[PDB]
Amino acid sequence: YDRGVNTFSPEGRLFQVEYAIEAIKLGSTAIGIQTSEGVCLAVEKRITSPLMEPSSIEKIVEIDAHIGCAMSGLIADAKTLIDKARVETQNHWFTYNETMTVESVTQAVSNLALQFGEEDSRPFGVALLFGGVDEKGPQLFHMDPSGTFVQCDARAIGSASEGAQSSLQEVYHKSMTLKEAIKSSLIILKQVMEEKLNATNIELATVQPGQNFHMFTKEELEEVIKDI
Amino acid sequence: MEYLIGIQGPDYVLVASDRVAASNIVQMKDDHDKMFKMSEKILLLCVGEAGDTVQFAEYIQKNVQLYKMRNGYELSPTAAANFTRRNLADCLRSRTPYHVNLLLAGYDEHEGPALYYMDYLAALAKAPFAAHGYGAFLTLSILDRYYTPTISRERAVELLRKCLEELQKRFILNLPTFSVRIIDKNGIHDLDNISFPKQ
Amino acid sequence: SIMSYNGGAVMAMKGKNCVAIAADRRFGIQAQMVTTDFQKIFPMGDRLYIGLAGLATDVQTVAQRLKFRLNLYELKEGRQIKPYTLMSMVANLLYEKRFGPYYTEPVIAGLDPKTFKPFICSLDLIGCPMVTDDFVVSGTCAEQMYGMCESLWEPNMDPDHLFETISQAMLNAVDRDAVSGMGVIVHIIEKDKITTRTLKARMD
Amino acid sequence: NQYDNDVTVWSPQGRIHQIEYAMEAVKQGSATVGLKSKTHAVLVALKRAQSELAAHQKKILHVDNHIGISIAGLTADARLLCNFMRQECLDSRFVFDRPLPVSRLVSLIGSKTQIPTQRYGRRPYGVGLLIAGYDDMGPHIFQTCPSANYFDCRAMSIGARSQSARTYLERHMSEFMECNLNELVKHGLRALRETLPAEQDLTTKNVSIGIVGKDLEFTIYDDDDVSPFLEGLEERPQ
Amino acid sequence: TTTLAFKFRHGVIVAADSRATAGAYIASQTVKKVIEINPYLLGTMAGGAADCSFWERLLARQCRIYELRNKERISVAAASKLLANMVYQYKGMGLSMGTMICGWDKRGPGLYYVDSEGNRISGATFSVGSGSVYAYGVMDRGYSYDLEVEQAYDLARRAIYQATYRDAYSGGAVNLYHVREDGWIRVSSDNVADLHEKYSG
Amino acid sequence: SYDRAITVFSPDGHLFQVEYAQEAVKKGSTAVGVRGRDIVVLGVEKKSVAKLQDERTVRKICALDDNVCMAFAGLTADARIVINRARVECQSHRLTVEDPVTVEYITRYIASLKQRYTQSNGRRPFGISALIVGFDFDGTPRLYQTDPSGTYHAWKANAIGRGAKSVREFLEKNYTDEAIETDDLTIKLVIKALLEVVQSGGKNIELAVMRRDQSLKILNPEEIEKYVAEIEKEKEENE
Amino acid sequence: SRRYDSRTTIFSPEGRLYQVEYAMEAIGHAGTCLGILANDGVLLAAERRNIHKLLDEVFFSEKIYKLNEDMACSVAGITSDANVLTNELRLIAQRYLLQYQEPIPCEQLVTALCDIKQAYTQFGGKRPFGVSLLYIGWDKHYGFQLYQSDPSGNYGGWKATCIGNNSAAAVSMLKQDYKEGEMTLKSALALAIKVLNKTMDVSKLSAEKVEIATLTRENGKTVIRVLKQKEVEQLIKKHEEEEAKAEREK
Amino acid sequence: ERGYSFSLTTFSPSGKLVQIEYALAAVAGGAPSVGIKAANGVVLATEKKQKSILYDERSVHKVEPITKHIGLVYSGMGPDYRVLVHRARKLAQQYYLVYQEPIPTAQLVQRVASVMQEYTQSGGVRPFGVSLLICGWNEGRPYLFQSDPSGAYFAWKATAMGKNYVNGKTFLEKRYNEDLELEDAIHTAILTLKESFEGQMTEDNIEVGICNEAGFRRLTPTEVKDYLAAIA
Amino acid sequence: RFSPYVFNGGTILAIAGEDFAIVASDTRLSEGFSIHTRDSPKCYKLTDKTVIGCSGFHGDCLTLTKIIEARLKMYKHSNNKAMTTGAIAAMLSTILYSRRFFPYYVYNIIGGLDEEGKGAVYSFDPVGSYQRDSFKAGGSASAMLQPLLDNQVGFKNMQNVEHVPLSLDRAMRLVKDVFISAAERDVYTGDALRICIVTKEGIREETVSLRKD
């Protein structure tokens, strides 16, 4: 029951990184949508106990002033990737006086997505969504523990990732607006979660070219629930 | 360049300092503090190279605070003084030589009060009074003159008045205001700021 | 010089069945004394001492490094250390710093741990041992100390006249020196007891 | 089966099965076709999509002003050899102030991939590099393998169902020398269309073409300037 | 080269000249010597221009990462401590850096002074440069803690003017910044030749 | 040099060793801790003294600084390495930036230390789970907790050790802000909660408080008898 | 390469350790030691496992390893696994003295060893120590102290202790016949002769099979005493006299 | 190598070390030997059989000197003996370079066993398969020590290792006593060597080295043939 | 002993226009009292909108040019775009500081268009400081060219002089006049005057001869 960490399958794929994709399935769900007006983003917190403080569990974590994030999977393994992605944007600005673009952030992140080994560890267990606004307008990307990096218009990952992507292809088009995409996302959220939607289960993050930061204090959250 | 003094009593340690932070020819800061509270019964001034005085006081501060935090009790002033002499003597023969000049002033619960001495060549000396700077050449005669091993602390402040009035009589320096501590069985006590008015 | 930074003087002298060692008390920086209680003679076991002179940094440093290796030796073995064994130990410790040398000149005096047989030696700053049968001296005022012991030492001497000879040797040589003085302590040890006296010298 | 675990262990038949498993990883990637004329070298690739909303995974990537490569297999081994590839080109550009000839650069790759195929605890690189470029003596089409046996070919295809792609090539390999670029390119994408099911071909979302030429730097087109090349085609017969 | 900085009731006032020379030759007249670090911190330039420009830019790198990890802006005494430790590692290798650190803190105003010699002192008034000694005298004659905003502008404006008038290496134009509680704000940028006609009458 | 991985993936998508060491935390003694608005409190249980031996060496509540207090579970030896490491880091933080260490900063140091101690090769994970209580500058009392995976995590009340979920279920029906009103009621809250733990005859209860302006002050074994007396008096009013 | 590893680092599937429990059961066999203090002074009881009549016994010192001028230890387990630890712990106590010029307190010396013994259990797959040992010592803060050590790196303060599996029944005696600060140093010695009489199954308690070493506080010397073989015998005849005296009531 | 460094010797579930117990089995199948300390010097005697008439006897040696007052024999396997001889040869020199004094016999056994104990705990090597016997007349009183592959060491009046080592153990308990001379010790050392040897005992069947306070000395085959009169 | 530095000469001029940038340099490469060549331009087309000039020690000029040309390609393969004008000036400052304790002996001027089509000129120093200016002159004849463009381009020290923006054709004859006057008094100013003009449509080069003494 003990085989190599660095061994191809007899069918020909791999051994362990195939299991890494399975580890994403036991994490909470998340939805991010790229619009021509901006990038909205959503996640579920999965509260366990009322003794637990809710704001100590975060999923949206800022990388730069104009780049957000979304994680699902093992928590503290993602905290290694967040701290590096913050630093490597600061190496970019303090050597070039410009902001690193949203695509070129994830290029530096996905380099050591697969660099595990003995000389020179195990592969990571988290899938990420990177939204942000740069010179090519708002962008949205998706990566994985296998280092496969791709751009998506509106990707949804997590435990309910299959039923989310099926329902999302029904309701998406290219000429969406911002607030239309926001309330359309939480309709998908309340279908795929099990608890009642309130001010504590979810949180949003919306970056715009105009409103340059993502800014989602609470009780704006209750303003959207009463409007749906 | 700057002046310190070390009057040791029967059950108290009387230390004083100056508040002048020098510059090229000007006086930038006139309420500087040379003192560093290592623990509840151990003080530490410093005199030396302008970059070296801060960090070695910071380095000795934390390593003594490790000892109290791990073992649950305070170092003796003897063991504290001999930890400082080790760190200067080790990195003396190195590419980064260290250049500071300061003793300790400590009160033990068993051994009572104590006063040490240190050179930048890291030599220890148990002493009943000491001084640094150029003012030591003008004050170690008075403090040798009017000394008694059984002196009281009211006389010792008055003896410190005699030591300080000869400073602003025959110097080429300014040195207006002098800060004074006192250490006893109850720990660190701050006496008033000894000064000299201008008008 | 670097040796003349703090100054000092250490003298040892062999008697009939006893040995005596003495040093000064002054601690100073080139013109300015600080105190009169700077220890320069350190016990290494019973009936065996060591004296150090030179730069006061290496006085306090070598006396702790030698004490470091000594306690490890007397716990791996059950016995005490022989005086020849200590002389080879000190000569090792100085030669390790061959090019960054310690600025000190040790003097070892002591008896046999089996018999009453005395032993004296002195070493260089890099570690050349040198054993004699009458006296060894070290410090800044070396030439004044040779003029005493070449004119006062006798071969077979009771512990009384040995004390009187090494006292007059120190008080006349150190008072001729400028940077050394401020009191002389004298250790005179024998088979049965250890006698330590402080002499009345010129405090100028 | 017990001798089919590590790279170091030989077989009793004499075939290290770890390399033979890495050949299967190349056959899982999407197909691509490269070929050359006397004066031009054109490689055409086929993209796939993970979903409808997801963008298509890119295949061709620029390396130097004359060298550009295609890809098949893994993506970690893609970028790991790519960073080694871009590094070696600018080194001789820095040292000798000249571009590398294509042939001896590929010999550095076979030396690079040799060590993890012999020592312990190191996988081979599952990768499918097709290489095109100019040295001083014309175009070249190279292919590699995880066994590090580089081949100076004239037209090959690697990836999923390239079996049918090769068969079109030898019955038109004589035409691949005198024809210029407008039909040289559309000779090549007539070979991709038999590596497909019979109901979709090339609809401006899944094909990319890289060309290196005499007075032409290596240029990659994708889905918008490919549309001038995609006209003038006959449909598949039945 | 002449800078000064002082804090009072309404924040901190920072002023500097704009002339950078090379021996007896003037390189430029429009050098921005007050290096803007953050929307809430300001740094100066003293002696080595590229030395002060590099390390304060490197200091801004650590303060930004500190804010992303701790969800809080850094304090003024913190940034002066980080800068003193970085420059100390190159002690004796010949760095020229005598800058100042300014900014608002949770403990109020913040003013520190960092040298390339390991000096790190707090205080109320400072003046750095080759013509710094000409700025101490006119400022201390006019300094009070209870000054007005328009009063503190004209004190620091003439103090730079009296320095450049006496000194040869100082000159150019007078930049003037105001550090407030919300953040710093640029006040004005005046020419010395225009101030000469103002203080003539 | 030991080039061998210990912790790898399972076919169902989990780690062995992380969910394999949390049972060692479950076999430790219990220690709870709540926070008020001015005075925090934390109390260990199951002293289990040998009644003829020393007790000042079996201390399960220590401090990293004059602000931060410790309480843990699991095995004894692994806590000693983590504690004596964290005493160095909180003191070296003051050698840097001159503030006292915020309680959120030291929990990120422990969790990041414990995470790479599972990520690396040839290294067993730790088998402890700590409670980190401090009232920093601005005087805001708060507490955190750790995990052998290395996830720092802020609560308002915690229960660990052998019988954690039962005490957490007791606090689950005990969300009253009135118990966090009076300080001695909050101490009696923990003493009532630790009474739900194993036998708790007033002798195995070692509690310690911190009034946010003072070092940790352990209550003497007379107020423990006094507070259990008034808890018995408050329980007598059930009729 | 990979199939030859022993995996002495992974936990048990029960959720506990797996290799340390195998090590701790070796301590119970091959050795039996104890120590008792209640007042000024502290004793150590040893036992000759190999008592063959062709040994030299010219070491004139034994399992009692005087590691300091104020401390010593009594070890039981693998024999030369201790000689690594005794030479190491002797130098930790000595490098402390170089740093401070003050003798090492007995508490933090034990913490220095227990961090070394844990470090082989944490990482590597190195074979852990099969060594448990005791501690005696005087300090400036608490005076006379006892400490038990474990292969796991765990320790604790004690006033009457045990090592051997035969001495597990001695703990039942030490709960029955212990006092609270009445250690006259004949009552503590006659108790130790009484314990090793019943526990050690060698009849009549021959004086060559056991060994007693004590530490008494002098004016400033802290005399460590390894008492000779003559006064062992009169202590045995004292205990045999008390057994014949106490049986008169029956 | 690579950096594996893992020890191949771990504990049993019973709580024993199995490879050390197996290494002692190779010691017990070694050549027999004996060593006797009798009141003025130590006598060592081994049992050297050439397997054929073609071997040379003046080439391979068993009684081996370490210093001018320290000798050393063994019972185990041949090639592993020559490793820790050359280790102990060098290790006696760093005492003499530091202290300028000949090393005591107790001081090697502290240090040689420390080499040997750490070598078992170290990674990727087997233990040795050699037990030793070390002799020397340091400071008047002579010494006789015995190490083993388990790292331990003892101090014997008289003992025997090799084959039939328990039979010569009962023989030395009855025949030997408290005190003897050097010449009486050689007589009983051959008497316990004749207990387990083959038929003919010549100057090449055995090989004997002794210690005196005059120093360590190895006997030539002339006097061994001369002492062979009144055999055993 | 082996001294690692030597002075070579050359003079670089840059003018930030409203929608253009003019970079000019001579072609003399001298050493000591001798002439190595008369054809050695200091212009280097980095991108289509950026030209750098390098003076001082010529061995460092050849090295520092080839370092920048590599990092332009390393930017593009990592970011799928080209660098701007200000990004190159920010990158060059870290490169010059990277050898702080064994410096280059090179005076650098970067001219070219910004991302809005306006002239930007960045001057440098041999240790790494930089700023954005309207016109700078570097090299051996730098002191003979700065105060004249203060009068003409800067319009300083003139009473009742209007501030007309400098056109393209007026800027051309300003460059051609100052190198004639510089060649009369400097001995390092050579023969051919390479003039590069960066517009929003490409880079034009032009060579004007001077006196050959």
Curated annotation (Swiss-Prot), chain C:
The modification N-acetylserine is found at S1. It is found in: Cytoplasm; Nucleus. Induction: Up-regulated in asthenozoospermic sperm. The modification N6-acetyllysine is found at K76. Its main location: cytoplasm. CDD domains: proteasome_beta_type_3. Keywords: Acetylation, Cytoplasm, Host-virus interaction, Nucleus, Proteasome. Disulfide bonds: none annotated. One of its GO terms (cellular component) is extracellular exosome. It comes from the Eukaryota. GO terms for biological process: proteasome-mediated ubiquitin-dependent protein catabolic process. InterPro entries: Ntn_hydrolases_N, Proteasome_beta_3, Proteasome_bsu_CS, Proteasome_sua/b, Proteasome_suB-type. Belongs to the peptidase T1B family. The 26S proteasome consists of a 20S proteasome core and two 19S regulatory subunits. The 20S proteasome core is a barrel-shaped complex made of 28 subunits that are arranged in four stacked rings. The two outer rings are each formed by seven alpha subunits, and the two inner rings are formed by seven beta subunits. The proteolytic activity is exerted by three beta-subunits PSMB5, PSMB6 and PSMB7. (Microbial infection) Interacts with HIV-1 TAT protein. Non-catalytic component of the 20S core proteasome complex involved in the proteolytic degradation of most intracellular proteins. This complex plays numerous essential roles within the cell by associating with different regulatory particles. Associated with two 19S regulatory particles, forms the 26S proteasome and thus participates in the ATP-dependent degradation of ubiquitinated proteins. The gene is PSMB3.
From Swiss-Prot, chain D:
Keywords: Acetylation, Cytoplasm, Glycoprotein, Immunity, Isopeptide bond, Nucleus, Phosphoprotein, Proteasome, Ubl conjugation. It comes from Homo sapiens (Human). This is Proteasome subunit alpha type-1. GO terms for molecular function: lipopolysaccharide binding. Glycans are attached at S107. The 26S proteasome consists of a 20S proteasome core and two 19S regulatory subunits. The 20S proteasome core is a barrel-shaped complex made of 28 subunits that are arranged in four stacked rings. The two outer rings are each formed by seven alpha subunits, and the two inner rings are formed by seven beta subunits. The proteolytic activity is exerted by three beta-subunits PSMB5, PSMB6 and PSMB7. Interacts with NOTCH3. Interacts with ZFAND1. Induction: Induced in breast cancer tissue (at protein level). Up-regulated in liver tumor tissues. PANTHER family: PROTEASOME SUBUNIT ALPHA/BETA. There is a cross-link at K112, K205 (Glycyl lysine isopeptide (Lys-Gly) (interchain with G-Cter in ubiquitin)). One of its GO terms (cellular component) is proteasome core complex, alpha-subunit complex. It is found in: Cytoplasm; Nucleus. Gene3D superfamilies: Glutamine Phosphoribosylpyrophosphate, subunit 1, domain 1 (3.60.20.10). The keyword Repeat does not apply. GO terms for biological process: immune system process; negative regulation of inflammatory response to antigenic stimulus; proteasome-mediated ubiquitin-dependent protein catabolic process. It comes from the Eukaryota.
Curated annotation (Swiss-Prot), chain G:
It is found in: Cytoplasm; Nucleus. The modification N6-acetyllysine is found at K126, K175. It comes from the Eukaryota. Coiled coil: none annotated. GO terms for biological process: proteasome-mediated ubiquitin-dependent protein catabolic process. Induction: Down-regulated by antioxidants BO-653 and probucol. Its main location: cytoplasm. GO terms for cellular component: cytoplasm; cytosol; extracellular exosome; intracellular membrane-bounded organelle; nucleoplasm; nucleus; P-body; proteasome complex. The modification Phosphoserine is found at S12, S74, S172. Keywords: Acetylation, Cytoplasm, Host-virus interaction, Nucleus, Phosphoprotein, Proteasome. InterPro entries: Ntn_hydrolases_N (IPR029055), Proteasome_alpha (IPR050115), Proteasome_alpha-type (IPR023332), Proteasome_asu_N (IPR000426), Proteasome_bsu_CS (IPR016050), Proteasome_sua/b (IPR001353). Component of the 20S core proteasome complex involved in the proteolytic degradation of most intracellular proteins. This complex plays numerous essential roles within the cell by associating with different regulatory particles. Associated with two 19S regulatory particles, forms the 26S proteasome and thus participates in the ATP-dependent degradation of ubiquitinated proteins. Belongs to the peptidase T1A family. This is Proteasome subunit alpha type-4. It comes from Homo sapiens (Human).
Swiss-Prot record, chain I:
It is linked to Neurodevelopmental disorder with microcephaly, hypotonia, and absent language: An autosomal recessive disorder characterized by microcephaly, intellectual disability with absent speech, severe developmental delay, short stature, and hypotonia. Affected individuals also manifest aggressive behavior and have hearing loss. Keywords: Acetylation, Cytoplasm, Deafness, Glycoprotein, Host-virus interaction, Intellectual disability, Nucleus, Phosphoprotein, Proteasome. The keyword Cell division does not apply. The modification N6-acetyllysine is found at K176. The modification Phosphotyrosine is found at Y122. This is Proteasome subunit beta type-1. InterPro entries: Ntn_hydrolases_N, Proteasome_bsu_CS, Proteasome_sua/b, Proteasome_suB-type. Non-catalytic component of the 20S core proteasome complex involved in the proteolytic degradation of most intracellular proteins. This complex plays numerous essential roles within the cell by associating with different regulatory particles. Associated with two 19S regulatory particles, forms the 26S proteasome and thus participates in the ATP-dependent degradation of ubiquitinated proteins. GO terms for cellular component: cytoplasm; cytosol; extracellular exosome; extracellular region; ficolin-1-rich granule lumen; nucleoplasm; nucleus; proteasome complex. It holds the Pfam family Proteasome. GO terms for biological process: proteasome-mediated ubiquitin-dependent protein catabolic process; proteolysis involved in protein catabolic process. It comes from Homo sapiens.
